[PDB]
């Protein structure tokens, strides 16, 4: 029923330590809440601050300011459009360069 989300990273998926990162979930229009998951059972962020990028899709962004070593690894995302959620997007791997 609902399309699968997409997760991308800005500037990119490889970030120097201490730099910044922004994850960008994308799904259809009319979405209520976007949720970014790192370890989906425990750790996740939720946002209703959703912006429209095209007539048929909206997107939301989550930003980490100071990237740590523990920030690397999996991220993926999923959105809620009542009454159901979507399926879970493909993974994104964030790597963190010391320099």
């Amino acid at each position: 029923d609902l399309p699968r989300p997409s997760i991308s990273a800005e500037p990119g998926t490889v970030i120097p330590l201490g730099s910044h990162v922004t994850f960008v979930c994308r799904g259809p229009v009319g979405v209520q809440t976007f949720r970014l998951e790192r370890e989906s059972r425990s750790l996740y962020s939720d946002t209703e601050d959703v912006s429209q990028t095209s007539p048929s899709e909206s997107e939301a962004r989550f930003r980490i300011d100071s990237v740590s070593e523990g920030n690397a690894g999996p991220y993926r995302c999923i959105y809620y459009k009542p009454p159901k959620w979507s399926e879970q997007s493909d993974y994104l791997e964030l790597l963190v360069k010391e320099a």
Binding site: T33, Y44, F62, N71, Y80
Partner: protein, 158 residues
């Protein structure tokens, strides 16, 4: 010299005293369980000053107010940044808020989930407090009504 006037006044004073004691006892039991569940649901971990911050107000219905604050605190301590609590901590906190659902999948977007569950907690306290309230109000009223008619019979003897 009929004692009807005194028994009417004894039972009226009886009803009003018993309703009062039953209210105080009623919505003081009802805060006891709200404070019990907040400690049980680990919300105490999200905001450390919550048991007192709700109790010192009286009126247990007022915990509904802390919804935006929990939502804020939940995302700040179990967010995607990596969070300030343990992952097992955050697993349960997410379960209790009804936000991440015991089998793994997603329950509710957190904006619905926090206001839902403590609206559930106030509705679960209202039945208990109304229960204690009408037991205590009847218990007190018949107790003080019998002592008062016993003394009003004792008084017409002399």
């Amino acid at each position: 010299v009929w004692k009807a006037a005194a028994i009417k006044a004894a039972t009226e004073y009886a009803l009003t005293e018993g309703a009062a004691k039953g209210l105080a006892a009623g919505n003081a039991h009802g805060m006891n369980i709200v404070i019990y569940h907040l400690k049980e649901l680990l919300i105490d971990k999200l905001v450390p000053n919550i048991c007192k911050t709700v109790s010192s107000t009286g009126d247990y219905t007022r915990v509904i107010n802390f919804s935006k604050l929990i939502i804020q605190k939940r995302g700040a301590m179990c967010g995607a940044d990596g969070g300030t609590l343990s992952k097992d901590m955050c697993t349960q906190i997410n379960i209790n808020l009804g936000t991440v659902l015991r089998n793994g999948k997603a329950n509710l977007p957190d904006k619905e989930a926090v206001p839902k569950v403590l609206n559930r907690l106030v509705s679960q306290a209202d039945k208990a407090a109304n229960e204690v309230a009408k037991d205590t109000s009847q218990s007190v009223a018949v107790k003080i009504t019998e002592q008062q008619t016993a003394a009003i019979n004792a008084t017409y003897t002399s």
